[PDB]
Amino acid sequence: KLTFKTDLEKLEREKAAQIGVAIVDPQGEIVAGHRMAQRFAMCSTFKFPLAALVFERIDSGTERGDRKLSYGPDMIVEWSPATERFLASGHMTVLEAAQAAVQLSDNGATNLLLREIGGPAAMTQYFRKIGDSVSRLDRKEPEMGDNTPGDLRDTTTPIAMARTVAKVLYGGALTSTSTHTIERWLIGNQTGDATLRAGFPKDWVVGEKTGTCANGGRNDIGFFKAQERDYAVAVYTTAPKLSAVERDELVASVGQVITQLILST
Protein backbone atom coordinates (compact mmCIF):
# COMPACT_ATOMS: atom_id res chain seq x y z
CA LYS A 1 0.00 0.00 0.00
CA LEU A 2 2.77 2.53 0.10
CA THR A 3 4.30 -0.20 -2.07
CA PHE A 4 1.00 0.19 -4.02
CA LYS A 5 1.18 4.01 -4.15
CA THR A 6 4.94 4.02 -4.74
CA ASP A 7 4.78 1.48 -7.51
CA LEU A 8 1.98 3.28 -9.31
CA GLU A 9 3.80 6.62 -9.07
CA LYS A 10 6.89 5.07 -10.54
CA LEU A 11 4.88 3.83 -13.51
CA GLU A 12 3.34 7.29 -13.88
CA ARG A 13 6.68 9.03 -13.80
CA GLU A 14 8.39 6.60 -16.16
CA LYS A 15 5.58 6.32 -18.71
CA ALA A 16 4.44 9.94 -18.47
CA ALA A 17 1.01 8.62 -17.46
CA GLN A 18 -1.81 9.27 -15.07
CA ILE A 19 -3.23 6.13 -13.49
CA GLY A 20 -6.60 6.10 -11.76
CA VAL A 21 -7.45 3.01 -9.74
CA ALA A 22 -10.14 2.00 -7.29
CA ILE A 23 -10.60 -1.41 -5.76
CA VAL A 24 -13.68 -2.01 -3.64
CA ASP A 25 -15.18 -4.94 -1.76
CA PRO A 26 -18.59 -6.31 -2.71
CA GLN A 27 -20.36 -3.61 -0.66
CA GLY A 28 -18.26 -0.84 -2.15
CA GLU A 29 -15.91 -0.30 0.74
CA ILE A 30 -12.54 0.98 -0.36
CA VAL A 31 -9.66 -1.54 -0.54
CA ALA A 32 -7.21 0.69 -2.46
CA GLY A 33 -7.04 3.53 -4.83
CA HIS A 34 -4.97 6.06 -6.65
CA ARG A 35 -6.30 9.28 -8.22
CA MET A 36 -9.55 7.59 -7.34
CA ALA A 37 -11.79 10.69 -7.62
CA GLN A 38 -10.14 12.18 -10.74
CA ARG A 39 -12.32 12.22 -13.83
CA PHE A 40 -11.27 10.14 -16.82
CA ALA A 41 -13.00 9.50 -20.12
CA MET A 42 -15.02 6.27 -19.80
CA CYS A 43 -14.92 5.35 -23.48
CA SER A 44 -15.87 1.73 -24.01
CA THR A 45 -15.99 0.82 -20.35
CA PHE A 46 -19.52 2.24 -20.27
CA LYS A 47 -20.69 -0.68 -22.40
CA PHE A 48 -20.71 -2.85 -19.27
CA PRO A 49 -23.16 -0.56 -17.39
CA LEU A 50 -25.14 -0.27 -20.64
CA ALA A 51 -25.55 -4.04 -20.64
CA ALA A 52 -26.57 -3.84 -17.00
CA LEU A 53 -29.25 -1.27 -17.92
CA VAL A 54 -30.50 -3.64 -20.62
CA PHE A 55 -30.66 -6.53 -18.16
CA GLU A 56 -32.56 -4.38 -15.68
CA ARG A 57 -35.14 -3.72 -18.38
CA ILE A 58 -35.25 -7.40 -19.22
CA ASP A 59 -35.69 -8.26 -15.51
CA SER A 60 -38.47 -5.74 -15.18
CA GLY A 61 -40.31 -6.76 -18.34
CA THR A 62 -39.76 -3.45 -20.22
CA GLU A 63 -37.41 -5.07 -22.72
CA ARG A 64 -37.22 -8.58 -24.22
CA GLY A 65 -33.82 -10.12 -24.88
CA ASP A 66 -34.79 -11.88 -28.12
CA ARG A 67 -36.42 -8.71 -29.62
CA LYS A 68 -34.98 -8.03 -33.07
CA LEU A 69 -33.36 -4.62 -33.63
CA SER A 70 -33.33 -3.75 -37.31
CA TYR A 71 -30.65 -1.62 -38.95
CA GLY A 72 -28.94 -0.75 -42.20
CA PRO A 73 -25.45 0.21 -43.30
CA ASP A 74 -25.72 3.70 -41.67
CA MET A 75 -25.38 2.01 -38.29
CA ILE A 76 -21.92 0.63 -39.07
CA VAL A 77 -19.30 2.82 -37.45
CA GLU A 78 -15.62 2.19 -36.76
CA TRP A 79 -15.04 -1.10 -34.96
CA SER A 80 -18.35 -2.86 -35.43
CA PRO A 81 -17.25 -6.45 -36.14
CA ALA A 82 -20.48 -8.26 -35.12
CA THR A 83 -22.79 -5.55 -36.49
CA GLU A 84 -21.02 -5.84 -39.84
CA ARG A 85 -21.46 -9.62 -39.91
CA PHE A 86 -25.13 -9.39 -39.04
CA LEU A 87 -25.81 -6.51 -41.46
CA ALA A 88 -27.07 -8.60 -44.38
CA SER A 89 -29.52 -10.39 -42.08
CA GLY A 90 -30.78 -6.92 -41.18
CA HIS A 91 -30.96 -7.18 -37.40
CA MET A 92 -29.37 -8.17 -34.11
CA THR A 93 -31.36 -9.07 -31.05
CA VAL A 94 -31.14 -7.05 -27.87
CA LEU A 95 -29.06 -9.77 -26.28
CA GLU A 96 -26.81 -10.33 -29.34
CA ALA A 97 -26.12 -6.60 -29.42
CA ALA A 98 -25.44 -6.43 -25.67
CA GLN A 99 -23.08 -9.39 -25.78
CA ALA A 100 -21.24 -7.90 -28.79
CA ALA A 101 -20.96 -4.56 -27.02
CA VAL A 102 -19.45 -6.17 -23.94
CA GLN A 103 -17.25 -8.89 -25.45
CA LEU A 104 -16.17 -7.29 -28.71
CA SER A 105 -16.60 -3.61 -27.80
CA ASP A 106 -18.84 -3.35 -30.90
CA ASN A 107 -19.72 0.27 -31.49
CA GLY A 108 -22.62 -0.26 -33.87
CA ALA A 109 -24.16 -2.72 -31.41
CA THR A 110 -23.72 -0.16 -28.66
CA ASN A 111 -25.43 2.55 -30.67
CA LEU A 112 -28.27 0.14 -31.52
CA LEU A 113 -28.87 -0.33 -27.81
CA LEU A 114 -28.56 3.37 -27.07
CA ARG A 115 -31.28 4.18 -29.44
CA GLU A 116 -33.53 1.56 -27.89
CA ILE A 117 -33.03 2.63 -24.28
CA GLY A 118 -33.36 6.38 -24.59
CA GLY A 119 -29.95 7.66 -25.61
CA PRO A 120 -27.15 9.08 -23.49
CA ALA A 121 -29.67 10.72 -21.14
CA ALA A 122 -31.20 7.32 -20.17
CA MET A 123 -27.71 5.80 -19.62
CA THR A 124 -26.95 8.69 -17.28
CA GLN A 125 -30.33 8.25 -15.54
CA TYR A 126 -29.49 4.57 -14.87
CA PHE A 127 -26.20 5.55 -13.27
CA ARG A 128 -28.08 7.93 -10.98
CA LYS A 129 -30.73 5.28 -10.15
CA ILE A 130 -28.09 2.86 -8.90
CA GLY A 131 -26.44 5.50 -6.69
CA ASP A 132 -23.74 6.71 -9.08
CA SER A 133 -23.90 10.50 -9.11
CA VAL A 134 -20.70 10.92 -11.13
CA SER A 135 -20.62 8.82 -14.29
CA ARG A 136 -22.14 10.60 -17.30
CA LEU A 137 -22.80 9.55 -20.90
CA ASP A 138 -23.22 12.56 -23.18
CA ARG A 139 -22.67 11.15 -26.69
CA LYS A 140 -22.96 8.00 -28.77
CA GLU A 141 -20.11 6.18 -30.47
CA PRO A 142 -17.62 7.01 -31.66
CA GLU A 143 -17.61 10.69 -30.60
CA MET A 144 -18.03 9.74 -26.93
CA GLY A 145 -14.35 8.57 -27.08
CA ASP A 146 -12.88 11.86 -28.31
CA ASN A 147 -11.37 12.49 -24.92
CA THR A 148 -10.61 16.11 -25.57
CA PRO A 149 -8.36 17.39 -22.73
CA GLY A 150 -10.46 19.06 -20.04
CA ASP A 151 -13.82 17.85 -21.34
CA LEU A 152 -16.02 16.47 -18.61
CA ARG A 153 -18.47 14.91 -21.05
CA ASP A 154 -18.48 11.11 -21.10
CA THR A 155 -16.40 10.74 -17.91
CA THR A 156 -16.40 8.80 -14.71
CA THR A 157 -14.03 8.43 -11.74
CA PRO A 158 -12.33 5.19 -10.70
CA ILE A 159 -14.18 5.10 -7.38
CA ALA A 160 -17.62 5.86 -8.86
CA MET A 161 -17.18 3.24 -11.56
CA ALA A 162 -15.77 0.60 -9.17
CA ARG A 163 -18.77 1.15 -6.93
CA THR A 164 -21.08 0.82 -9.94
CA VAL A 165 -19.44 -2.47 -10.88
CA ALA A 166 -19.87 -3.75 -7.38
CA LYS A 167 -23.55 -2.75 -7.28
CA VAL A 168 -24.21 -4.59 -10.50
CA LEU A 169 -22.29 -7.74 -9.72
CA TYR A 170 -22.62 -7.99 -5.98
CA GLY A 171 -25.13 -5.44 -4.73
CA GLY A 172 -28.39 -6.88 -6.06
CA ALA A 173 -28.95 -4.51 -8.99
CA LEU A 174 -29.87 -7.44 -11.24
CA THR A 175 -31.63 -10.76 -10.74
CA SER A 176 -29.42 -13.71 -9.94
CA THR A 177 -29.81 -15.05 -13.47
CA SER A 178 -28.98 -11.74 -15.15
CA THR A 179 -26.06 -11.16 -12.78
CA HIS A 180 -24.61 -14.55 -13.63
CA THR A 181 -25.00 -13.95 -17.36
CA ILE A 182 -23.22 -10.60 -17.34
CA GLU A 183 -20.48 -12.06 -15.12
CA ARG A 184 -19.86 -14.84 -17.67
CA TRP A 185 -19.83 -12.29 -20.49
CA LEU A 186 -17.09 -10.38 -18.67
CA ILE A 187 -15.07 -13.51 -18.07
CA GLY A 188 -15.38 -14.38 -21.75
CA ASN A 189 -14.56 -10.87 -22.98
CA GLN A 190 -12.43 -11.14 -26.15
CA THR A 191 -10.61 -7.79 -25.91
CA GLY A 192 -8.82 -7.90 -22.57
CA ASP A 193 -6.17 -10.61 -22.90
CA ALA A 194 -3.29 -8.14 -22.78
CA THR A 195 -4.62 -5.66 -20.19
CA LEU A 196 -5.55 -6.15 -16.52
CA ARG A 197 -6.13 -9.86 -16.55
CA ALA A 198 -2.65 -10.37 -18.05
CA GLY A 199 -1.31 -9.00 -14.78
CA PHE A 200 -3.41 -11.10 -12.39
CA PRO A 201 -2.64 -14.63 -11.08
CA LYS A 202 -3.98 -17.28 -13.41
CA ASP A 203 -6.13 -18.93 -10.76
CA TRP A 204 -8.12 -15.73 -10.03
CA VAL A 205 -11.54 -15.55 -11.60
CA VAL A 206 -11.49 -12.31 -13.58
CA GLY A 207 -13.95 -10.57 -15.91
CA GLU A 208 -13.55 -7.11 -17.38
CA LYS A 209 -14.47 -4.57 -19.95
CA THR A 210 -11.71 -2.60 -21.73
CA GLY A 211 -11.68 0.83 -23.28
CA THR A 212 -9.38 2.66 -25.68
CA CYS A 213 -9.87 6.28 -26.63
CA ALA A 214 -8.11 9.08 -28.27
CA ASN A 215 -5.43 11.18 -26.61
CA GLY A 216 -3.92 8.24 -24.76
CA GLY A 217 -6.84 6.69 -22.87
CA ARG A 218 -6.59 2.99 -21.88
CA ASN A 219 -9.01 1.59 -19.35
CA ASP A 220 -10.24 -1.69 -17.85
CA ILE A 221 -13.02 -2.27 -15.33
CA GLY A 222 -14.48 -5.40 -13.86
CA PHE A 223 -14.14 -7.89 -11.05
CA PHE A 224 -11.81 -10.49 -9.67
CA LYS A 225 -12.11 -13.32 -7.16
CA ALA A 226 -8.84 -14.16 -5.35
CA GLN A 227 -9.98 -17.57 -4.04
CA GLU A 228 -12.99 -16.54 -1.98
CA ARG A 229 -12.37 -12.86 -1.79
CA ASP A 230 -14.44 -10.89 -4.30
CA TYR A 231 -13.48 -7.43 -5.50
CA ALA A 232 -14.59 -4.83 -8.05
CA VAL A 233 -11.93 -2.78 -9.82
CA ALA A 234 -11.76 0.19 -12.12
CA VAL A 235 -8.58 1.29 -13.89
CA TYR A 236 -8.44 4.40 -16.04
CA THR A 237 -5.16 5.58 -17.59
CA THR A 238 -3.99 8.40 -19.74
CA ALA A 239 -0.64 8.07 -21.51
CA PRO A 240 -0.56 10.26 -24.60
CA LYS A 241 3.12 9.47 -25.43
CA LEU A 242 2.92 5.69 -25.37
CA SER A 243 2.17 3.37 -28.25
CA ALA A 244 -0.89 1.14 -28.14
CA VAL A 245 1.12 -1.96 -27.13
CA GLU A 246 2.82 0.08 -24.40
CA ARG A 247 -0.54 1.18 -23.02
CA ASP A 248 -1.70 -2.44 -22.85
CA GLU A 249 1.51 -3.26 -20.96
CA LEU A 250 0.86 -0.29 -18.66
CA VAL A 251 -2.52 -1.65 -17.69
CA ALA A 252 -1.09 -5.17 -17.17
CA SER A 253 1.57 -3.58 -14.96
CA VAL A 254 -1.23 -1.96 -12.88
CA GLY A 255 -2.72 -5.45 -12.58
CA GLN A 256 0.57 -6.69 -11.09
CA VAL A 257 0.62 -3.80 -8.56
CA ILE A 258 -2.93 -4.64 -7.59
CA THR A 259 -1.91 -8.26 -7.22
CA GLN A 260 0.95 -7.53 -4.85
CA LEU A 261 -1.42 -5.64 -2.59
CA ILE A 262 -4.10 -8.31 -2.62
CA LEU A 263 -1.60 -11.08 -2.01
CA SER A 264 -0.31 -9.21 1.09
CA THR A 265 -3.68 -9.79 2.84
Closest CA to 195 of 255, 243, 244: 255
Q: Which amino acid, 180?
A: H
Residues sharing a CB contact under 8 Å with residue 72, sequence separation 6 or more, in sequence order: 87, 90
What letter does residue 264 receive in the DSSP assignment?
T
**Which of these, 109, 102, 82, lies nearest to 209 by C-alpha position?**
102
Residue 141 is labelled as binding a ligand: yes
Residue 200 CA to residue 208 CA, distance in Å, equals: 12
- Domain that residue 200 falls in: 1-265
Kindly report the CATH number assigned to the domain that includes residue 39. Answer: 3.40.710.10
DSSP calls for 126-173: HHHHTT-SS------TTGGG---TT--TTEE-HHHHHHHHHHHHTSSS
Give the DSSP letter of residue 35: S
* Cα(141)–Cα(160) distance, integer angstroms: 22
Chain center to CA of 246: 20
Strands (E), the chain: 18-24, 30-34, 40-41, 68-70, 91-93, 155-156, 205-213, 217-226, 229-238
Catalytic residues, which ones? 44
- Number of domains the chain contains: 1
Nearest to 222 by CA among 212, 230, 232, 236: 232
62 is in an annotated binding site: no
Taking the C-alpha atoms of residue 93 and residue 83, their distance in angstroms, rounded to an integer, is: 11
Determination technique for this PDB entry? X-ray
Task: Tell me whether residue 212 is annotated as binding.
Answer: yes
- For residue 126, the one-letter residue type is Y
